[PDB]
């Protein structure tokens, strides 16, 4: 086993947001994408089998899966078609994630924080905060 495992592993279910269409202005995603990605409902599935974590993002809006070794860099294509450069690590027992394009960063870290996973995106000053549960 290991922390990775014992603290995210599983099929998550979002139950709150706040801030989520601020930070998405920040982002720079238009009217139309914030609109219908803001009504989703996503579910977060992670797994992990050996060194290589999976992130699964299941909503009526976009499906989107990433694979990845803690460290090392990936290219991904975010639900609002962002080709960004993204590297993920382990960090104190928070997952955080960088994604670089066109210049700019955001972060997205995921806590254990009771029953819940708690997930934080930032750009510049905007912090959103999305709530998930199991499943
Ligand atoms: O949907 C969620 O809770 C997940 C949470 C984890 C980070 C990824 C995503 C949030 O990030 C998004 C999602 C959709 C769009 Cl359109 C943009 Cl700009 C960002």
């Not at 269409?21 to 996503?42: I, Q, S």
């Not at 797994?47 to 976009?62: A, L, M, P, R």
């Amino acid at each position: 086993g290991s922390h990775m495992c014992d603290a995210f592993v599983g099929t998550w279910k979002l139950v709150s947001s706040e801030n989520f269409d601020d930070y998405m202005k920040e982002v720079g995603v238009g009217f139309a994408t914030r609109k219908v990605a803001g009504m989703a409902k996503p579910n977060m599935i992670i797994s992990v089998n050996g060194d290589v974590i999976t992130i699964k993002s299941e909503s009526t809006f976009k499906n989107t899966e990433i694979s990845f070794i803690l460290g090392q860099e990936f290219d991904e294509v975010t639900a609002d078609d962002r080709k960004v450069k993204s590297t993920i690590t382990l960090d104190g027992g928070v997952l955080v994630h960088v994604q670089k394009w066109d210049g700019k960063s955001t972060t997205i870290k995921r806590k254990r924080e009771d029953d819940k996973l708690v997930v934080e995106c930032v750009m510049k000053g905007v912090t959103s905060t999305r709530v998930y549960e199991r499943a």
